Design a binder for this molecule. Structure first.
Ligand SMILES: [Mg+2]
Length: 97
DNA sequence: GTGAAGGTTCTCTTCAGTATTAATAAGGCCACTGTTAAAACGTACTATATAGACATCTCCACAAAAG
């Protein structure tokens, strides 16, 4: 019925091969998204090599629930003015969830 | 004494006695009981002070399903 009423979360394998800072191949990361079902903002993400795990879920949840701050190395013109807790959380059946 | 031997009386004794204060006692053998300390000595209803065979809960490690 309103914003934050149901957040939704899932993970997927990003389709970019990453590299170490020394330049050698690192297998693709996983991306986790937390999404407002009303508003349809993306509320927060976690991007990393760690497989789908409750610590990864918790890491996306932290970013989503908390206010956002980014420095000038992020050349943003907008601002990611979204925060606050969900009232419900809607997921698939993964063992992390 | 000029010395020795011998003569003589002297009374009455109805008066004196009878009372306490009394010392622990002053008996010794025998045998035979029956108390009287008090010493020696079997064993009970207890009050504890352990020592250690067991039972228990807890923490950590392995096979089945979903994305
Ligand atoms: Mg999923």
């Amino acid at each position: 019925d309103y914003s934050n009423h149901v957040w939704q979360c899932d993970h997927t394998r990003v389709d970019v091969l990453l590299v170490d800072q020394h330049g050698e191949i690192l297998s693709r990361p996983w991306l986790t998204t937390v999404i407002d079902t009303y508003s349809r903002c993306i509320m927060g993400i976690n991007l990393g090599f760690d497989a789908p795990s409750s610590g990864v879920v918790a890491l996306a949840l932290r970013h989503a629930i908390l206010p956002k701050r980014y420095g000038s190395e992020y050349k943003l013109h907008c601002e990611w003015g979204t925060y606050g807790k969900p009232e419900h959380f809607y997921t698939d059946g993964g063992k992390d969830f």
